[PDB]
Design a protein around this ligand. Structure first.
Ligand code: HEM
Ligand code: HEM
Ligand code: 4V4
Ligand code: 4V4
Ligand code: H4B
Ligand code: H4B
Ligand code: ZN
Lengths: 411, 407
């Protein structure tokens, strides 16, 4: 079966054959679309086909499909599953797997860079302290004094689901949020629950507007431990505006390194519950969502006040006007300190080319339009006008429940 | 089977039960989501009439009444005899308001119940059609105080006798392909603009020439008519701070009036059902003016603002986009023509969603279309999970007549 997508700006039509290789569900049916819904211990039984599938993919990519090296590996894995109920990936397989999980990530606009991913194998790690070490090294390597490099660190895979490695932080670097008795919030409202946990686990909170959270690390199913990332390894960028001198006085800054640490990495049916990954920011992530979401820092009014916009009627577009200047400020700041960042025009245009190249060479590119289109200026980016097919391929990054909700406390 | 939707900005969760009444298909499967794709007999007829009459009679709190049962047999008799049936005025009106109510892609649906319905099923000719349409335009325009309306022409019979309005909207600017290779006027209408000329229209070959109506009655050949200019309300576009802005020579019409869709009610098909409301500002300023394949004026506005257009990262496109949209709202409000900004309209839609969930068990909605094409996440609909499904009565797409019509 062939499926066609059309770009309604360029009339370019592409044909997808890759969806045929799609396994997992979407959440949609013939009678209902769930494309705007945010969130849509394995047996030896189901494990081997999943291993076989992966290994088949792997050996095809290296052009050794049906070789003795291929067959022997299948046999080898088959036996290891029957006698041990699981198996270990070769380094080459782990690297291929991690890159392809990124490549298959349909909500990610930045996938043109997928083949350039630095894979840190942390499968020999045994303790929280060991995790801290790996993570520090990840952060130093990725930051690279401002010239950012994509990386992922992979901790040991799930066994019986009782010895999980987990990073409790949603991101490696993130600002604390504090609920005040008056109901207002100090810092990042999105991190209030996590900050409270850290505090309870013994973290002495400085209680400012931008306190870098501590790492809360769980190894081998044990209770999580607190570590503070060395400040010298956390690159931050004070935000200022190229024309507005008062902007610096808002007191804003942000960190340079976006690093997601709460996702699950599935490769060949194996589950890696601790796999922090990092790249670089698209400007709007900070300047639109982080600064301007009503439930985040929420700086639109204060910025608009200073620009002296007509804030009486929404139809003055004072919110839209302030949003653009804030986003201009974020980009100007990062560029000025030579910390890697990409604007949403540049990023979306690159994704279009990547997507086109993925149709030619791969037969498709699964993409989630709802997430790909930037949260400001949507239709002046080429992705707005691009029809996309969303379906799920493995290897993949998956969601997983927050550890504080599932963890068995030891004491 | 009882689905929930969350607003991630307010934590409000709503439970959807209405989707269970859905009958038509979405185009998605368990394996692939097509949510971003633009375009996915007597025995057929009677269940459709039934489903429709059941909901109609339920809406008037007379489910399982003699009148209900009586009407059901009456329509059954008529289908079994005529191979079709006629809607009572009351059903027709209910039908139309519900097609709008059910339009999952429409952000302006909070007003759905105040639709003025013009019954034009007695129409037999294109001059006839023209007369109905002029009346519609005048009534809906209301000297700038816009009122929603629909005019309904006779239902399809054998597909040989279709009424069609060939225009996509009642009022649209013409578009011409100059020998330069460039495009003068609206590029979206180049092909239809040729068909007008091919059928006899004399273009003023300008930039904002109001297209002529091309009307088809009983499957006959379509005819041209020029709407009385005095009935087409337009808004010169100026900026409340940029005095130079008016020299760009931009204007826009006040009445958005979609004329090419198909209205399906109780199995019956109305291929000519022009309807109209009032603009949300971004349709004009973001899409019409700044789409690359439309008037595409970003670069020239940017020049006039003397913005640093060297790098994409100065966000000069974004900056101009805001100003252009500021101007659109300003000009319409200044001339007292109804318009709504994307903040007000999306906040209204959220309130409507809440009303629909609490009073109907849900509200079908297409996030891809509801989220305005600028400043998406600073409007509340961005953070609102929505379920998309197909309810009837409905507005559907239908093929362009020129590809179909047998002369
Ligand atoms: C290098 C530059 C990168 C850019 C500019 C980028 C951009 C983005 C953006 C803007 C999102 C939307 C998330 C949000 O708005 O909350 C996203 C999602 C995502 N990204 Fe990327 N990313 C980059 C690197 C990476 C890397 C290195 C990985 C994995 C190895 C990755 C995997 C993902 C995944 C799995 C999602 C899905 C999130 C979800 O499902 O909720 N990205 N990306
Ligand atoms: C009164 C103020 C109204 C507003 C502000 C409004 C707004 C909108 C907008 C912005 C869209 C997106 C379409 C696009 O971007 O091209 C839309 C779609 C739509 N509207 Fe409304 N509308 C209004 C009245 C009406 C009325 C009176 C009807 C029918 C009687 C209607 C039926 C529809 C339908 C069927 C669609 C989707 C068409 C499709 O499937 O592509 N609207 N509306
Ligand atoms: C509900 N929010 C999603 C949080 N998650 C799971 C998530 C996943 C991937 C990406 C993001 C946005 C942060 C980010 C991460 C990376 C590696 C790059 C980038 N530009 N942004 C967030
Ligand atoms: C891209 N979609 C095709 C154009 N169609 C079929 C379509 C249908 C309904 C609405 C629109 C947008 C124009 C419009 C119409 C009405 C009544 C109100 C309004 N504010 N805008 C367009
Ligand atoms: C590819 C994508 O489906 C297409 O660009 C859609 C996106 N959302 C839209 N939303 C609205 N309101 N109007 C449109 O024309 C479109 N176009
Ligand atoms: C309800 C809706 O799906 C939700 O708000 C989505 C919309 N699109 C998004 N797009 C990005 N990049 N990030 C997001 O968190 C979201 N959130
Ligand atoms: Zn879908």
């Amino acid at each position: 079966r062939f499926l066609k997508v059309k770009n309604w700006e360029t009339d370019v039509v592409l044909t997808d054959t890759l969806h045929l290789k799609s396994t997992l569900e979407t959440g949609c049916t013939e009678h209902i679309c769930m494309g705007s819904i945010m969130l849509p211990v394995r047996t030896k039984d189901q494990l081997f086909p999943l291993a076989k599938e992966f290994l088949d993919q792997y050996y095809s990519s290296i052009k050794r499909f049906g070789s003795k090296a291929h067959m022997d590996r299948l046999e080898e894995v088959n036996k290891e599953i029957e006698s041990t109920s699981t198996y270990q990936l070769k380094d080459t397989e782990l690297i291929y797997g991690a890159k392809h999980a990124w490549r298959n990530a349909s909500r990610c606009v930045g996938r043109i860079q997928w083949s350039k991913l630095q894979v840190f194998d942390a499968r020999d790690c045994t303790t929280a302290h060991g995790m801290f070490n790996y993570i520090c090294n990840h952060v130093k390597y990725a930051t690279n004094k401002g010239n950012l490099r994509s990386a992922i660190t992979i901790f040991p895979q799930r066994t019986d689901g009782k010895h999980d490695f987990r990073v409790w932080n949603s991101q490696l670097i993130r600002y604390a949020g504090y609920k005040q008795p008056d109901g207002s919030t100090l810092g990042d409202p999105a991190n209030v629950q996590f900050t409270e946990i850290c505090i309870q686990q013994g973290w002495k909170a400085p209680r400012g507007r931008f306190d870098v959270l501590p790492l809360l690390l769980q190894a081998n199913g044990n209770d999580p431990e607190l570590f503070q990332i060395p400040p010298e390894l956390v690159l931050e960028v004070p935000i200022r505006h190229p024309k507005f001198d008062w902007f610096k006085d808002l007191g804003l800054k942000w960190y340079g390194l976006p690093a997601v640490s709460n996702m699950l990495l599935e490769i060949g049916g194996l589950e890696f519950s601790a796999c922090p990954f990092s790249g670089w920011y698209m400007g709007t992530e900070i300047g639109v969502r982080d600064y301007c979401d009503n439930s985040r820092y929420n700086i639109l009014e204060e910025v608009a006040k200073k620009m002296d916009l007509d804030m009486r009627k929404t139809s003055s577009l004072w919110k839209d006007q302030a949003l653009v200047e804030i986003n201009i400020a974020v980009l100007y700041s990062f560029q000025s300190d030579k910390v890697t960042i990409v604007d949403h025009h540049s990023a979306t245009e690159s994704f279009i080319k990547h997507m086109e190249n993925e149709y030619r060479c791969r037969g498709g590119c699964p993409a989630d339009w709802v997430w790909i289109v930037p949260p400001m200026s949507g239709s002046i980016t080429p992705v707005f006008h691009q029809e996309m097919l969303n379906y799920r391929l493995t290897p993949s990054f998956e969601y997983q429940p927050d550890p504080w909700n599932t963890h068995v406390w030891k004491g």
